[PDB]
Amino acid sequence: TSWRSEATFQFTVERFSRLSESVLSPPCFVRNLPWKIMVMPRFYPDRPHQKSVGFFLQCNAESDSTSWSCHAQAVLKIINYRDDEKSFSRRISHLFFHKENDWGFSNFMAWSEVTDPEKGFIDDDKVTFEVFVQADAPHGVAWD
Ligand SMILES: [Ca+2]
Ligand SMILES: [Ca+2]
């Protein structure tokens, strides 16, 4: 159910080379909360072309609630279509709540690397992002 404790979901960004804003994946429910992948181009002077791929995990952002929380561990990965041994991923641990509903990397990968038609992260101008997330939740199992 949507109350599962963990899940793995993907988000394929099409016409990637033309991405000019931040885009969100549809919601994946874990612990009855909507989790989404956020992807956007970011400016980094030292990178080749001063451009990098921003990749973040977002939780329950549309809710107006200010009384929720979810501590989660996750793996943020850009899938390598050709070799599963060559995918690039980074792990995070963060307490998600209304004031800090997203967490990730603004310089996840060089824009020139992800779009290199020879490295295996892009195909037909499409890049696929994946997140494995495990989250906890409050409950009433307590005792005197
Ligand atoms: Ca947007
Ligand atoms: Ca109880």
Numbering used by the authors: 63 to 206
Article passage:
Herpesvirus-associated ubiquitin-specific protease (HAUSP, also known as USP7), a deubiquitylating enzyme of the ubiquitin-specific processing protease family, specifically deubiquitylates both p53 and MDM2, hence playing an important yet enigmatic role in the p53–MDM2 pathway. Here we demonstrate that both p53 and MDM2 specifically recognize the N-terminal tumor necrosis factor–receptor associated factor (TRAF)–like domain of HAUSP in a mutually exclusive manner. The crystal structures of the HAUSP TRAF-like domain in complex with p53 and MDM2 peptides, determined at 2.3-Å and 1.7-Å resolutions, respectively, reveal that the MDM2 peptide recognizes the same surface groove in HAUSP as that recognized by p53 but mediates more extensive interactions. Structure-based sequence alignment of the three HAUSP-binding peptides revealed a conserved four-residue binding motif with the consensus sequence of (Ø/E)-G-(Ø/G)-S, where Ø denotes a non-polar residue.
We crystallized this domain (residues 53–206) and determined its structure at 1.65-Å resolution. As previously reported, the HAUSP TRAF-like domain adopts an eight-stranded anti-parallel β-sandwich structure, with strands β1, β5, β6, and β8 in one sheet and strands β2, β3, β4, and β7 in the other. The overall structure of the HAUSP TRAF-like domain closely resembles the TRAF-C domain of the TRAF family of proteins. In addition, the HAUSP TRAF-like domain contains a shallow surface groove in the middle of the β-sandwich, which corresponds to the region where the receptor peptides bind. The fact that most of the conserved peptide-binding residues in TRAFs are no longer present in the structure of the HAUSP TRAF-like domain indicates that the TRAF-like domain of HAUSP represents a new peptide-binding motif in the TRAF family.
